[PDB]
């Protein structure tokens, strides 16, 4: 069976009784500091600290001025000069907030077109490069060091409906996005053009110049498919050169562009084939906006469903379809799980729910 066994050690619930839409552990936390995770739901973000005996210690929240803000997503990075962690949050107002997680001060914020942001992701090798996916059909890439919009990934050949999820590949050379138009789309960011644009974003200082920073309008993905799912594609991750993606059809598909022997870096915009390498089925998850996560090493994969059941897959197997499943249930956990998060060391798994409950599963 599955190499990984968890026991439920604690549970709690936030005062607001709104859905907790996102949970992220901080993977940039220093050696010897306790494991910290952030939740988003309602118009706030909250930080907790994990301790022994399953204790989840409440710290401090950032509550938005606007009572109409609903936070959907968060991501951790760090300040590239001082070593300090940063937390970006976003939601329905379409405003990105950079939060100092110590004081919970909002350091600065970015405004796109002001339409819901569904997901945020930081570059795996550049802590400054923030990617946001939006209800307005577009993805934007930001440089949060020089406070510049590097590019908009949109256009007619872009997504024709909400973008719900996106992921950088390992070296942060290409992005794969997905959304309500049933399509998964590839956008390379290692082209001459984009590497140059990123470099220019680093040279830009508004006080040393007269020009505004000109962003790139990227209107053509480098690959596209609608052959994986038959509904809203709400979650995507890279597993090396392979893709893991889901819709609301109770399945996580493992797939790649082109035929079996096709190299990912040789795939052209016209490519018409994909190759299904496997599919992990589960039950009762046919609402949309239900995100799986993986641990740091990508050894395992966790997904909650709509009645409070957790699925964990052991990916540490020769081929994708050989993955080992185990399930985590609790009698008092009955509300929908929106997202899971592993700690960096993999000893703790956190699930969050539509009833504002938080569930802590510790690894045996």
């Amino acid at each position: 069976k599955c190499k990984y066994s968890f026991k439920c050690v604690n549970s709690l619930k936030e005062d607001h009784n709104q859905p907790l839409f996102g949970v992220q552990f901080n993977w940039h936390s220093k050696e010897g500091d306790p494991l910290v995770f952030a939740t988003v739901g309602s118009n706030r973000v909250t930080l907790y600290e994990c301790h022994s005996q399953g204790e989840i210690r409440l710290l401090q929240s950032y509550v938005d001025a606007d009572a109409d803000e609903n936070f959907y997503t968060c991501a951790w990075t760090y300040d590239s000069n001082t070593s300090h962690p940063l937390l970006a949050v976003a939601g329905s107002r379409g405003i990105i907030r950079i939060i100092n997680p110590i004081t919970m001060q909002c350091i600065k914020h970015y405004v796109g077109h002001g339409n819901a942001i569904n997901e945020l992701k930081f570059h795996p090798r550049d802590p400054n490069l923030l990617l946001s996916v939006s209800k307005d059909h577009a993805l934007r890439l930001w440089n949060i060091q020089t406070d510049t919009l590097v590019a908009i990934f949109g256009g007619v050949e872009g997504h024709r409906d909400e973008v719900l999820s996106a992921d950088y590949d390992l070296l942060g050379e290409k992005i794969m996005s997905c959304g309500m138009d049933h399509s998964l789309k590839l956008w390379r960011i290692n082209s001459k053009r984009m590497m140059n644009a990123i470099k220019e974003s680093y040279d830009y200082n508004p006080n040393k110049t007269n020009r505004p920073f000109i962003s790139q309008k990227i209107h053509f993905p480098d690959f596209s498919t609608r052959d994986i799912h038959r509904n809203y594609v709400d979650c995507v991750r890279w597993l090396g050169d392979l893709i893991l993606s889901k819709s609301c059809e109770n399945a996580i598909v493992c797939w790649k562009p082109g035929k079996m022997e096709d190299d990912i870096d040789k795939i052209k915009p016209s490519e018409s084939n994909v190759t299904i390498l496997g599919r992990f089925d589960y039950s009762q998850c046919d609402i949309w906006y239900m995100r799986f996560s993986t641990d740091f090493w990508q050894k395992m994969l966790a997904l909650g469903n709509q009645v409070g059941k957790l699925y964990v897959w052991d990916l540490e197997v020769e081929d994708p379809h050989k993955a080992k499943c185990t399930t985590l249930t609790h009698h008092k956990c009955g509300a929908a799980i929106r997202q899971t998060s592993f700690s960096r060391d993999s000893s703790i798994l956190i699930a969050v729910c539509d009833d504002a409950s938080i569930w802590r599963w510790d690894r045996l």
């Binding site: 859905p19 509904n231 809203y232 609301c248 046919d286 609402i287 949309w288 906006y289 709509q306 929908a336």
Partner: peptide
């Protein structure tokens, strides 16, 4: 396809 149990 709803975000939650009977939505819009």
């Amino acid at each position: 396809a709803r975000k939650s149990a009977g939505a819009a």
